[PDB]
Symmetry: D3
Subunit: 175 residues, 6 copies
């Protein structure tokens, strides 16, 4: 069974969504979901000594403008294992373009860690942390000759808007 | 869902399967999603405690608290979530959590020769039993929940409860 | 011995040195050997709890409990024991341990821009303060010791106590 | 169901095969796929304080002379998680017998780590590294009283021929 | 200052000794104390994928027949850092010869971990654990062409005897 | 006191030098020796989620054009602890400028890991690995607004000449 197709986008969209984690914070290995089988697959080893600064994954049953499931980054104190489901509250969105593709990514916090109880919008995140995430996506494919453009951060309302768009796109492509 | 498809064990109740959800050393509490059988984050423990054992469930069991029967396996090196271990029950922790009978089997892996002579609760260092009981006594304290630890039962008692849980599953499901 | 040779800080009490003894995530409790200044195992915590912060002492301080003044530094990645960190005090945990005044400074590292806007106790998520207090409330429970947590003071109060501890050191030693 | 039966042997066999990893480098726990459910299973804890020196798994849809799927060892700088699929280039083969059975193992490098771009055959591997792998397999079951015999290393050409034979054996026995 | 010369052999010799740890359990790197300076030094990387099964170090102010400080192995649940002092209770001794040298090693438990409160003699240790330690020292230098002979285990009384011998030897060589 | 002043530059300079490690591979924390006490000090947390790709330290009793001890990078398979001494063979040198200062760094392999026995010059290192190290230094201070310039790599001969120059500079400035 392919988790991407079988799980709902979340229990209370768009206030609480499911994040299906593919890459735990601290990994230099970039994993993806195998399209056919739903197994974890190594996509590549990052060409530079950078690590994913957040737990990284996808929202099930979404589709985005770049022709992939919609990506979500979840701030976890202790990283989870790949293929773990996290109930996540979206708090913002990173706007960026990768080789002409709109490759925006939702930023979210776990609902069930009380540490983040007061994080509800992009302004609640330390600025240095946002910069470190943006710098990662700006440079992580530099040695592969790819250029990415970081366009800035959007707030929680914008993230939620985009999640609803992505859910609709999925329904139109597969349903 | 691995909970339904796997047998309770290759030689019940002397050897059961433990389906591990939480490796020793984790502060994240994981459970199985009941719809899909994927691992799911239940919560992050509110206190800086870590699971002192690999923690999971015995497949095709059901217990008084309306959940699969819990099992704790002592592993020298923790396994990954969703790993099956063949485990020998050596005892049982008796506890209530918010008025529900929430007993948990203590077990050792059959395939680690380190534990070959552990066969009953008396073979476990007492400081180690204390640390496990203390974990369950306090790990939900900041969530305002009360747990009562009632003590430890021996291997025979553990095995009786396993048989009871295997029967309860058959009733409720088929 | 690093405790005696290092100054209390480059800009007391706004910036102090923390000499780390125990990295976050350790179950082993380390201290400095007073004769040699080497790291020494004090004990293994009796319960499966881990230090929720990097834990150490402020050099050339002394406190009411007859020890160097304790400091807890919030580090995203833990450091190695015997590492010096430049730390900004943002608060103070008030607690008694077996009748001794055992207060501990809470601090953030100056050189991690993540914490640039943490300047007082109100900037810390309350769940995090709770988890620290809970650790010290229960970590010696199985050793039969009682600790009393009296609450948190703010940055100004922390800095006053640091000045007091720096003076106490000068009295007792030279 | 069971990734061993559902996945193809590789996207471009035998030049590029899939390695389905069961044991990450650094593990003292020896895991195997439960061939009923396809879940990871603990087979044993190694009796000696040795760790797997490579990420160890099987090639899907293969069968070998010893009556199990064909083993593959992938050199990863950062170990992956169990049940991860890696696209791998075979560069050689370890010839060994375990309890009288032909228990040969493919040695491979990941296609998507540029570090190994110039590793194409067995002669590209540091000799000390080949020795460490062989010594592990020579001794890891010694306290269990089993005997293994290390017969040496074959080159990439030989490894690829054996992969094709294993693919054929699977077809005859199941397909 | 050199810790080997400055620290006493222990607070209550031979019932409780100091172990100055050089190698934490799980390390493949073999560290030693630099003779001149007392700093940690890499001696070698073990040639095989084996890890030290115990925290490993020396007793300060001792000298043994093999012309080195007397070695001690401490069973720790969580490994310590190098150059950490542990108050340790000797419970046995491993008898072995390395290239003609008597290279016996004390086995000990930490006084301040209540897990080991009842471990007082060699018979309290699981047999499989003793075997795993012995197998490690039997084979860890095999690829270096060295042969070691394991002669067996002695009890707590014998360990204590040897500690007293080693303390006296030190006094005669340096004092 | 201060290992930087007490230790010799190496046992057989410039063929074999001592590397005194300050930062283990994998660290995002940047450590430096406190030049008053010789204790390890946190200099900064890197502003970006990058990790040191090598074990990083200094050669004792050296001084360089940028007014600090000469930097050395040691390739270790398993990282060591801070303040560990490694006997290292120089195989090359990274030429770079940091804020207008000549901040060149020796690249070296450990003498006592047989894995690197055949690494003797810069051409023996996989090109992707040299690129990853250079990219780290090109970008690791970008969010601090500092600029570094990577000028390329020199061979073992050049590295050894620079080591001798640094040893001489130390003598003139302190000795
Ligand atoms: Ca995308
Ligand atoms: Ca239960
Ligand atoms: Ca105190
Ligand atoms: Ca085989
Ligand atoms: Ca010896
Ligand atoms: Ca420099």
């Amino acid at each position: 069974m392919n988790p991407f197709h079988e799980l709902e986008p979340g229990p209370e969209v768009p206030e609480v969504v499911y994040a299906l984690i593919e890459i735990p914070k601290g990994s230099r290995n970039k994993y993806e979901l195998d399209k056919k089988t739903g197994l974890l697959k190594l996509d590549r080893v990052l060409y530079s000594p950078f690590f994913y600064p957040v737990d990284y994954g996808i929202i099930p049953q979404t589709w985005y403008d770049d022709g992939d499931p919609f990506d979500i980054m979840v701030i976890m104190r202790e990283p989870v294992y790949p293929l773990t489901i996290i109930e996540a509250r979206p708090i913002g969105i990173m706007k960026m373009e990768d080789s002409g593709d709109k490759d925006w990514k939702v930023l979210a916090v776990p609902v069930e860690d009380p540490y983040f109880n007061d994080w509800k919008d992009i302004s609640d995140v330390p600025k240095a942390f946002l910069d470190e995430i943006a710098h990662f996506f700006q440079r992580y494919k530099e040695l592969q000759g790819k250029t990415t453009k970081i366009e800035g951060w959007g707030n929680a309302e914008e993230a939620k808007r985009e999640i609803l768009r992505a859910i609709e796109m999925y329904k139109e492509k597969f349903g």
